[PDB]
A and B are shown apart, each in its own frame.
Chain A
Amino acid sequence: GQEPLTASMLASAPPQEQKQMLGERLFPLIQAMHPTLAGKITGMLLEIDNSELLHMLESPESLRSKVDEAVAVLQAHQAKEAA
């Protein structure tokens, strides 16, 4: 919509606020395709390395790849807590 995420926001911030802001903004961004597993998805994706996400979120083959992978991983734990 306006004023999208920028590496600057994290550049002028601590190593804690990073995952906070980034993950917080990525939470909804993931819901675009997985509004259910958006949580776990953003969680693992935020663990690997926030920096990587700041460069992966700028690509379709990457974004969809991460989301898909994550969701696939949760397949072992639980999908919608209905098992």
Chain B
Amino acid sequence: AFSRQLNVNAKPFVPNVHA
């Protein structure tokens, strides 16, 4: 991603799923 490995703790995203 940048130099070799990235962070896994990185949150996903803001989906459109409520109910």
Residue total for B at the interface (Cβ-Cβ under 8 A): 13
Residues of B within 8 A of A (CB): 1-2, 5-8, 10-16
Instruction: Kindly count the residue-residue contacts between A and B in the assembled complex, taking CB atoms under 8 Å apart.
Output: 49
Q: Are A73 and B11 in contact (CB under 8 A)?
A: no
- Hey, which chain A residues are within 8 Å of B7, CB to CB? 44, 73
Of chain A, the residue at the smallest CB distance from B4 is A69
List 10 other contacts, CB 8 Å, given A44-B10, A47-B13, A69-B1. A19-B14, A23-B12, A23-B14, A24-B16, A39-B12, A44-B1, A44-B7, A47-B10, A66-B1, A73-B8
Contact partner of B1 (CB less than 8 A), chosen from A24, A39, A48, A74, is: A48
